[PDB]
Design a protein around this nucleic acid. Sequence first.
DNA 1: TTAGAGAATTGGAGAGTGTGTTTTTTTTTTTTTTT
DNA 2: CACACACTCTCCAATTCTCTAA
Lengths: 94, 660, 55
Amino acid sequence: RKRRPQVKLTAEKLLSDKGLPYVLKNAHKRIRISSKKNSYDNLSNIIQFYQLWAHELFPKAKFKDFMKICQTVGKTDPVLREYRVSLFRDEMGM
Amino acid sequence: FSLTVLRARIALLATAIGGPPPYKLGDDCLACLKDLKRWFKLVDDQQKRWDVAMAVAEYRILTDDLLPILIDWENKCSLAAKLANKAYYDKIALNCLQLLVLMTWPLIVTEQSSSNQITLYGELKKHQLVYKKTILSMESGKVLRAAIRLALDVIKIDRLSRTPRDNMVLKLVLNFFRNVIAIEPGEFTINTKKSMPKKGITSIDTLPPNVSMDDISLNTVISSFHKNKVFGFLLTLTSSLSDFINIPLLEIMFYFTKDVNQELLFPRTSAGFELSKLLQKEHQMRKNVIKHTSARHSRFGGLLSIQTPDKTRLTVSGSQALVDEKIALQKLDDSKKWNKRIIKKEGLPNSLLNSQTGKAIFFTESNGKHFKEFINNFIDSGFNILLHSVTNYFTTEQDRMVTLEQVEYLLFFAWFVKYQLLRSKIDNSADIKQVSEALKEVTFILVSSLLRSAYDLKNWTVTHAGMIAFNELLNLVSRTKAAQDIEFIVSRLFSDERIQLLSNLPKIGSKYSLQFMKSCIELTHSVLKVLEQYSVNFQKVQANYMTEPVIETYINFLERFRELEDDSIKKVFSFFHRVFVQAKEQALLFRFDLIILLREMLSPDGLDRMSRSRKYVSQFSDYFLARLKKRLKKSPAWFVGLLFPPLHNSEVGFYQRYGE
Amino acid sequence: IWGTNVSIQECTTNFRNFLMSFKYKFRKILDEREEFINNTTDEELYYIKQLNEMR
DNA sequence: TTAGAGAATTGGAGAGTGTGTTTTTTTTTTTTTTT
DNA sequence: CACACACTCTCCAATTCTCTAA
């Protein structure tokens, strides 16, 4: 009767297992930094982590569309801002 | 049945006027000319049919009969003017030129216009180009020499001795010049009543076979103007300014310069050096292109698996991916066939209202040299006098000015005041006082009032007509300050009332044409430099500029690096460069949009390697990465906060954007 | 490489270290050639000489 | 000006009407001009 | 004949929009 609706970026999907915990864990042990190397290589390595996170979290949409939708959701949906405030408060304790 | 009867009458008039092989005036020629004029006037406005003009163009009347009338009258006029029924032989050209200007009148289609006008607009715009094609190529286009006779007959007498009737003759003849040169190809009005198929519009060339883009460009118009001596006519008409010869003349000599850039004037086998440079550039970009293509054929079958996190065995093809992992990831990215929806949007003579930066009309070197001195002679003759003549009229009927007047006036003013300053910059032989007369208080306040009034009515085109002048206002203030109190009264009213208007347009115009976005960056760049010599506060004006939509509209211009020039990238990057240490507000710059554009910039597929743009940008990006690493290493949550937009909470606003 | 459980990096390193520092003497001793006394044609870096010839 | 309740439109899957094939010139007679 | 292709006919929920929301 009706086609299966396309999967969109729901709030629950943003907290997937291969998501925020994964990047928070691997930020300090995934990407190497060296100013001696050309800046293009460093920038590509930095964007590699986010690109793989987006693909293994949402292989339907591309890079730019995914980031645009995420930015619009963050500017619109206040739950993301609340979560960011909560993590900021937690980090402020140290 | 009515239409074919109309065609029959047009053919009957065509064989009644006469023909060649010298053209002969048939019996009752004046009567048939008056009949044709009456019929065309009746069908133009009283009935609004636009069908008589069509029949006239069909019989090639303008080419076969009308033009030879003026050509045959030219030799008689020359003989009569050099020797030392003249009234009958003079009045015959009046009706012919009145018909010519009427057919050459630009056609405007709006919502209130009926279906016949819009239906026939696409079929008559090509004939409009045909008229100017055959006029310009008719033995050096001498019909304009006959046209200027229809003006010198009336202007010869004293201006105080003008005629309440003959005064309309000057308007009628003057309209012909602006009408012939405003003829431009239209737009293919696609019938969007149904969904378009898997294929787009086949041909966008709206030119009949007799009309070629070679024979209709503004280069042809300028060459015809030079070869027909009408440069002297345009100079002498302005030399005697000291009403009705101002509004038409405002656009008679503006149409061919409404969109022509002044950069082509100065070069900064002669044409072949730029040819060799362009061949080098295209060879470089083609060399960059082949870096992705495989050394062998496509069917070689290079298959690989990327052992991505989670031990994934995703399969992506291509021997190019076997060279670099980044190429494999890019092939992963572009493999998806799904795309999002990108939203998108001239009613007046096309120009900056609709012209991209690369639309530089090709000019012959001799033609360019002639045009370099023609406009300079006009400026040295009557520029400021013509401006002061229309200053009084501009001060009245503010709400009675149709939207055409603003686009035909503000663009003229801004273009010429910009040209004078650039010409003074390149060469010191021109004084700044030749353009300094535009700093009048009343003119400035009226143009500012028009600019601010155009904002509330959503007339974005009219407002864009105003920013181009507002840029040169600040530019001329700076020029007259550096090269020097008259500048203060013009550059002190933007204290509190005008700061909102200048700081709101960048935040809202990012969803419109490219040139609308380009105007605001020039406005900010000029305003940040005019006030640098006096600092009302440098740290206070910049506070209202550092806003997230402003950064968004600046970075949205950088995504077009395939067409951005050296100065276009220079201004955008220098806006952030000048606030790196002077303002220290880099926290709002931490969006991924700028990082991906930096990756595109330093990549060889973007900016040129041999040019002088990617070196300082690369070094500044090297420092940018150091700043990013330093700021990210001190906040684990900032690793993911770099993607999300900033927050409105009180404490975090200073905790994250300033680091306590 | 898909379907092989073979890393491209190790293959590239193997071929790289095979390119230079390799001499035709290795081939001369691989086939048990008795006349391996030759020095210039065997002990010289054959592939380095080939790369120089290409250059 | 912000996070959130209301209208308004149209693209991506699917109902459906009509298509498009397979499909062939070998081998064997009979004639005709040169040989 | 019928299975696969190309494409006109036809249709609701996610995507955009501007009046009333905080």
